[PDB]
Write a protein that binds this ligand. Structure first.
Ligand SMILES: Cc1cc2nc3c(=O)[nH]c(=O)nc-3n(C[C@H](O)[C@H](O)[C@H](O)COP(=O)(O)OP(=O)(O)OC[C@H]3O[C@@H](n4cnc5c(N)ncnc54)[C@H](O)[C@@H]3O)c2cc1C
Ligand SMILES: Cc1cc2nc3c(=O)[nH]c(=O)nc-3n(C[C@H](O)[C@H](O)[C@H](O)COP(=O)(O)OP(=O)(O)OC[C@H]3O[C@@H](n4cnc5c(N)ncnc54)[C@H](O)[C@@H]3O)c2cc1C
Ligand SMILES: Cc1cc2nc3c(=O)[nH]c(=O)nc-3n(C[C@H](O)[C@H](O)[C@H](O)COP(=O)(O)OP(=O)(O)OC[C@H]3O[C@@H](n4cnc5c(N)ncnc54)[C@H](O)[C@@H]3O)c2cc1C
Ligand SMILES: Cc1ncc(C[n+]2csc(CCOP(=O)(O)OP(=O)(O)O)c2C)c(N)n1
Ligand SMILES: Cc1ncc(C[n+]2csc(CCOP(=O)(O)OP(=O)(O)O)c2C)c(N)n1
Ligand SMILES: Cc1ncc(C[n+]2csc(CCOP(=O)(O)OP(=O)(O)O)c2C)c(N)n1
Ligand SMILES: [Mg+2]
Ligand SMILES: [Mg+2]
Ligand SMILES: [Mg+2]
Ligand SMILES: [Mg+2]
Ligand SMILES: [Mg+2]
Lengths: 586, 587, 586
């Protein structure tokens, strides 16, 4: 059949499992938007306020799905706003296909052309960047983008298609590749690696299992619970792993790291051995600025590139996390030293339950205070009173990150969402809409800073029009609080950190969202209830302090050290001059 | 002599004429922000709601100054939001220096590092991209960035500095290059080229002078007025040149192009010869999608890359526009065929005034009607009643761009501001705030679509805190109106074009800005008076049609052609298969 | 200890298993060459005639070793000659670390600087490109280059180091990373993928096993022989797989492809099922220009990126080749339909032995003719008379490639060497020296075209000085014969294909190598014997025809189709003009 390039793009997206499109109109995306109107996928298109906002919605959607189920489709110069959200998708292992419709290929390369987008600007960011030159390559390029996005590591793929190819027509026989099969990711380890891992776990005096986001992608929750109870070993997570182990369990120490739970950081500091499953041991995760001293450890990942890149393990294993844990459970009964004992009766149990008890006690102190300005831990205690096991907690980047991570007690995977890998401010609100779209039976609670919300609150348009009932708490301190605190620490003085807020209640109301301030009442519980009862997206304005959280609270972290001291650098004495220095010698 | 890298960065910026910093705080820009607090630039700091809004402010400030007077200074990952503004700066010839402070150079190249920004993403966009490796190269790199940025052509320069270098200390002797005098840009043309141009101009039956952006940069307004009156030749502009020739003059035909004045397009279609001064003859300018047929022409520019790249001139001249006009003025009296008569007495004068009067009559007609929805041409007629020669008109991108350009009647250079080169949606409000900052005693009027305003109205924080009293009119139609109109024409149906507006008055009021809707009054005149009287940034909501403007109004345009017909493309029958096609051959 | 950057580079190379350095001197490599003189590795440095020649020696060395055992180290502007050999290492999966010493970092970025090498020119080629900014990062960068080079896929890694860092000094504590462990590559498949593969093999009427270079990297020869005899299935290889199965076995069909053995191409055309092990199914390999129609197949690779990229398998499996084959052998006895029968008694045996017999018969016809000009198949028959099982056959790119591939009958892996992935002319001679250096108990026989040998015969310097007794046959036809033939086919006329040769015997003699022409004698057997007896590198000049081989001989290929016909392309009618067209409308 003769079809337009635009029709073929839509066909390819459908064929590879696309569920949601986030799209922006302009002359170069007109044929694509028309094609979409004639197809199933056309019923699910979000038109965002900005392309960057839309790109964050893709990331929030796909983060919780672990596939490229949301796809961006953008008019040429709109693609120029993608890079920040794309960089998060790359280091954060978020599958994300973006299709940019560039201007007419006939005008490419002409110096005075308009809206010829430099697609090569994505080469250092996307896991795959393709410029499509020929109509008969559109299906093949889209196929390749999805293979790349959904591989190990997951990440973003950018496809640049000059829009004249979307208007042109071609016979479609075999053009969109069909019948594609994927290899399983259930990679098994060799018996001897399994036995060695088991023997170390058994011989350790104070082992820990460290479960990262890979355990979530793996589906390894059930095997992890079994394993930990069988060996009687406390479980620490990364922030992307949090919730793969029920955080109300006695062996649950929570997440390690600089914004994590002190019980986890204590347990990591006390451990003599760690079994790491599905973690990349990253800079703002377990590495803490590459300061963390890891105990002897076994490291199991599906991505060989993360194994041994910085931390040298006792043993590295290329295996799926669930599968590895299943292999361990089978081998443990024939492992020298293993005794089947209730985890409560093991000798390491009391130390772990002590660490968790002290952390819980500290959290209870943080959340117990009444009144205004509010504790962000108190705000999270109120959320927990109305929270379901499938609900999603979203945060932005700032002081507020710490109380959000600390007051989230999670029972399922992929329920904690932010710009994890890159810490890009403004991510929260639009990632929350993305997650809501992907998970319509989850209530989505976002705790955002005021500096953060300033970025993409324009997307209340999308929250209102698509009836996405995200409950947003905006923590107001009229400051970039983390920056305030860190400057205060480093210099004893802050600069560029202070600003005015609008009447956020008034902003919400102007969009037709639910709005309420607790500034005078302190009634967070009632504000949450009325917000939930409205059925609308909601904004609850909650004044807090400039310093509570990431930059001040002691949770046992050791880094990252962003507060450098300098070094004195020797001048170059080799005899060569500086530019302009010739005039000094005259 | 002993200084931190952060102090040397500040010292270099001050040395090369920086007047305004637009900066964004974070763990990598902490040192820089501290150093700036020790400088007189410390009081001239704008902290924008987002780095992209800030980068648009940089573009608006520098567009009106023709130098990199405003500089950006950004925490590592905020640099990832710059690309769209930076691309307009590149093709739009706006000088712009951006300093990105990256994360620690010790952590660079680690696969699991956080906030290590891929500075290489700027290589295809900036006219200069540098990654500084060494503390003793920071002054040198910044010097180079200004050299590129304020060259011919002007554009953006990006410098990536790992922030450990900003904390490190070094003896500062000779580190910041100082005391350069740049080359003059008053390039003279050869005598023979000036005399050939004079002879073409005199021999033409119906000549036109086309003045672009380059005439504004050259400071050539006075020379142009003298040349145009002395030969009696009508003047056509590009949108960036508009105002270099007073548009109330009898010889002013306005701007040619698809959102230009019909008088200018009528003139261009009637001319037998064009003298092109400081125009790049661009896709969305004079070329109109490379469909415009140019008459025989002489092309004078300082940038040889634009001369003969697409349209082949009769004669190409590398020279400064002002300087060339001066040279022409001096040779014309000795040029065979020249006659010294008042421009009103030439026979070509009548046709030009007819073209201008028919255009003015059409504009008068678009101004009439009342009440609701209102005409955007009516909105501009009300602005003109309150507008002084030094005041600035800003627009965003969409249907509304055409009445903003058609309703702007300008008497000075650099008074019409937008994302000219790239038509990046959203640009209007923050570029207007940048322009206001550059000219605190000019009034700045913005006409913006509702789609457009949605991008960076968050920068009302900056407008309110810094008391930048931009007068913004937001044209409401609950639509990407251009898309609605054109998609209906292409396909019989619009898609992805419609959206809800907030209560725009309520948004302004929530920021502390002046807000008023004319939905129930039609009282644009009174709204403008009250907005001006408020002394605050102001937002006036004006309901408009989905169709008025760019997608609907005939102004003599021939292009561009974005509403493509397909071609049917032959399949490759050489024997190579598609991916997956192996499955289709299994019997 | 305070050490120079140069000393630290040498330390890192030693620590990561470097055996051979190929190095070129200049002001920027002076400190490195000095450091090398003070260390074990300094005894093994080849100084080549050119950096490109040297880069091919790295590729020949590392091709046969399957690790980055040879390393390039180059003065700044010398690195500009690397790109061709580096591109082969990338698509050809050859591990190769190259260290470029750039000019002084103080002069970087200055427009009028000399010898500031644009290291970004390697970004699109190397699997990893790093520019080192800081002395304390030299060890870490070299560590990362080796992890990358020796991963799956293998490939080149480029490290650019401004030479001032090689002269500078730093305390060395922990600077070079030590104690690095690698994950095994013995990835196991899930039981159900194994059982499904076994069931298909058993149920097939005419199965084939296709073994690629991955079987060589895997060490899978023994398991392959067992498997094939157990199921009674004929074995086809790729050209990089050739020799993983003894090519004198009754089930050995040889290599498929456009320069392969007709028995293999027949068997592929007759097969109803293929089990593909360690092959990427490439353009100039099995795909034959993407024209080859693959039967239903199972595809097993360690690199998920090759699985399903073009050919859609019945099943894709991420597993090590040897391990997979071991798993199959275990599962086969409990697989429905399997009967233990001598492979000679299976029903498919007669068809396979017929295909091989016809091919052998054709080869015997090609090699039997006496006299001059010579058959290149006759030349390969003479090599076979003096050939050991560990000997290496090298070829360059041309008509001569086909007889070289056809007349090589191999019994061990990694014995057939050329620019396999990219077909870059001139590769042969220097790759042969590289292979000789890596394998000093192998005799290395190169059959090269005259157009090919012209590139890097300057490296006879290296062959003579290091006593590398490569036996080179130069096939003279005074032409780029493959080009002659293909132009003749396409146009009926050739252009740019003809040239003069020097007296090649005289060239060899001028270097102190052994030289002999068979132009008058036809005595290839005696020339080989005297060349071998000399103990020197040798050149034997052998006139041949312009057309024998790749471009003419029927071996059952179907592609690639480089002889396109064109299509008529519609003009653009949208109304926009060409540059300069304005003058046509005047
Ligand atoms: C302000 C801020 C504060 C933060 N604080 C913390 C903190 O305190 N603690 C913290 O942990 N993080 C924190 N982060 C997040 C941190 O930056 C990283 O995003 C996070 O630590 C990475 O988690 P991970 O190591 O589990 O790997 P991920 O990024 O989740 O990647 C998944 C890993 O699992 C592997 N994998 C995938 N699938 C499988 C499978 N099937 N089998 C095996 N392996 C698989 C992948 O190859 C990869 O190595 C913070 C972020 C910010 C912005
Ligand atoms: C929606 C939309 C509609 C538009 N419609 C129109 C329209 O109708 N008409 C129109 O013209 N534009 C239009 N534009 C703008 C258009 O895209 C270009 O930005 C504009 O035409 C470029 O102007 P210019 O050719 O004068 O060159 P500029 O971009 O202003 O560049 C300046 C030129 O002069 C040169 N120069 C600089 N200094 C000197 C000197 N001292 N001496 C000599 N030469 C010098 C430079 O090298 C360069 O060639 C539109 C844009 C948008 C987004
Ligand atoms: C003139 C010329 C003619 C040619 N003619 C032919 C021809 O007729 N036939 C032919 O085959 N080639 C031919 N080639 C070579 C061809 O271009 C390719 O280089 C070759 O076919 C690739 O072999 P391969 O598919 O085995 O993969 P390789 O390039 O050898 O790559 C190895 C593959 O095995 C995998 N692998 C690596 N280790 C393991 C492991 N442990 N377990 C599992 N998998 C692993 C890798 O991921 C990869 O997919 C020719 C080249 C030239 C220049
Ligand atoms: C795009 C971007 N710009 C700047 C920063 C630096 N940054 C990190 S946290 C932060 C503070 C955010 O302020 P707010 O959202 O109000 O949260 P608070 O610290 O007050 O809780 C800043 C400015 C960043 N990470 N990303
Ligand atoms: C970043 C970006 N996204 C999309 C476009 C395509 N585009 C061009 S004009 C326009 C319409 C703008 O709508 P509005 O501001 O409401 O103006 P109207 O057309 O209604 O006057 C769009 C979506 C663009 N140029 N830039
Ligand atoms: C670097 C390079 N240049 C050109 C070619 C194109 N090419 C491929 S085979 C060949 C013929 C080589 O001639 P020769 O070595 O004499 O071998 P013959 O075909 O005569 O056997 C040519 C020119 C190539 N592959 N690589
Ligand atoms: Mg479907
Ligand atoms: Mg805040
Ligand atoms: Mg609108
Ligand atoms: Mg050793
Ligand atoms: Mg030849």
């Amino acid at each position: 059949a003769i079809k337009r390039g635009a029709d073929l793009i839509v066909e390819a997206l459908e064929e590879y499992g696309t569920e949601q499109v986030v799209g922006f109109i302009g002359a170069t995306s007109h044929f694509v938007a028309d094609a979409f109107s004639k197809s199933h996928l056309g019923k699910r298109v979000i038109n965002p306020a900005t392309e960057l906002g839309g790109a964050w919605m893709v990331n929030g959607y796909n983060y919780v799905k672990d596939r490229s189920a949301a796809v961006g489709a953008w008019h040429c110069v709109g693609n120029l706003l993608l890079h920040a959200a794309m960089q998060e998708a790359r280091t954060g292992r978020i599958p994300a296909v973006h299709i940019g419709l560039n201007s007419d290929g006939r005008l490419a390369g002409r110096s005075e052309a308009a809206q010829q987008v430099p697609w090569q600007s994505f080469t250092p960011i996307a896991r795959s960047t393709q410029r499509v030159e020929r109509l008969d390559k559109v299906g093949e390029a889209i196929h390749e983008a999805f293979r790349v996005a959904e591989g190990h590591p997951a990440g973003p793929a950018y496809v640049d298609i000059p829009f004249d190819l979307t208007a042109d027509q071609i016979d479609d026989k075999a053009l969109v590749p069909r019948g594609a099969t994927r290899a399983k990711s259930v990679l098994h380890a060799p018996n001897e690696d399994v036995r060695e891992a088991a023997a170390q776990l058994v011989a350790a005096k104070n082992p820990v299992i460290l479960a990262g986001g890979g355990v979530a992608r793996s589906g390894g929750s059930e095997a992890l619970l079994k394993l930990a109870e069988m060996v009687g070993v406390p479980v620490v997570t990364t922030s992307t792993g949090a919730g793969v182990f029920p955080e109300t369990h006695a062996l649950a120490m929570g997440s390690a790291g600089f914004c994590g739970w002190k019980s986890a950081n204590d347990m990591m500091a006390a451990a003599d051995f760690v079994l790491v499953l599905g973690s990349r041991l990253s800079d703002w995760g377990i590495a803490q600025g590459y300061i963390t001293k890891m105990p002897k450890f076994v490291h199991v990942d599906t991505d060989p590139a993360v194994l041994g890149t910085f931390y040298f393990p006792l043993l590295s294993v290329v295996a799926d996390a669930k599968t590895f844990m299943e292999q361990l459970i089978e081998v443990l009964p024939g492992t020298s030293g293993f005794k089947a004992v209730r985890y409560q009766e093991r000798e390491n149990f009391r130390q772990a339950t002590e660490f968790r008890a002290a952390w819980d006690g500290w959290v209870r102190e943080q959340e117990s205070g009444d009144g205004m300005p509010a504790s962000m831990f108190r705000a999270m205690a109120e959320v927990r009173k109305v929270q379901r096991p499938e609900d999603i907690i979203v945060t932005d980047i700032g002081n507020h990150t710490l109380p959000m991570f600390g007051g989230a007690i999670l029972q399922r995977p992929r329920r904690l969402v932010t710009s994890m890998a890159e810490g890009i401010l403004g991510c929260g609100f639009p990632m929350a809409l993305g997650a809501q779209l992907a998970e319509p039976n989850s209530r989505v609670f976002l705790g955002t800073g005021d500096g953060a919300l300033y970025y993409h609150f324009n997307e209340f348009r999308v929250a209102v029009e698509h009836k996405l009932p995200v409950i947003t708490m905006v923590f107001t301190n009229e400051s970039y609080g983390a920056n305030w605190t860190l400057m205060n620490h480093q210099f004893g003085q802050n600069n560029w950190t202070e600003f005015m807020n609008p009447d956020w209640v008034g902003i919400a109301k102007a969009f037709g969202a639910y709005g309420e301030s607790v500034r005078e009442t302190g009634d967070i519980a009632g504000a949450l209830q009325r917000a939930i009862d409205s059925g609308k997206p909601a904004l609850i304005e909650i004044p807090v302090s400039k310093t509570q959280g990431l930059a001040s609270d002691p949770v046992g972290g050791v880094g990252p050290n962003l507060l450098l001291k300098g070094r004195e650098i020797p001048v170059d004495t080799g005899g060569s001059m500086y530019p302009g220095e010739n005039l000094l010698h005259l």
